[PDB]
Structure 1
């Protein structure tokens, strides 16, 4: 619980709790605008949104690892 909610909550760029494609492509490489190859980031977020309208809410990523 604590490590996954810490990581996803820094990852949400405030977003009301939701993460989109441009937020992940900016924040992935944590020091400013560092995301170097777009294909690595696009593959990881497309496999982590299971349906969720296309942009990830906090319960999806954590139930995907933590499911209870």
Structure 2
């Protein structure tokens, strides 16, 4: 299970790139969020993630979908 500390850190790193504070980021900023967490995904691995959290291809990711995908990755 994710810990409270993991959820809080995932939230904080995401929020660094949510400039308008509405709980969404662009798919182009997902790698920057992951690197902010000290991870180093490949472009490949980023594409697979974007495939899970931006199924419709609108180029946005909300925090709930980011968090469950990370739960699955961790």
TM-score by length of 1: 0.52
* Conserved? CA contact 1:19–1:57, under 8 Å: yes
Question: What are the ranges of 5 or more consecutive residues in structure 2 without an aligned counterpart?
Answer: none
Q: How many residues align?
A: 64
Q: CA offsets, 1:33-67, max 9 Å, x none?
A: x95731111211221235594411223344676xx
Considering only aligned residues, what root-mean-square deviation do their CA atoms show, in Å?
3.7
Instruction: Identify if the C-alpha distance between structure 1 residues 49 and 5 changes in structure 2 by more than 3 Å, giving closer, same or farther.
Output: farther
Which aligned pairs between 1:44-63 and structure 2 lie closer than 5 A?
44-51=49-56, 53-62=58-67
In structure 1, what is the equivalent of residue 7 of structure 2? 4
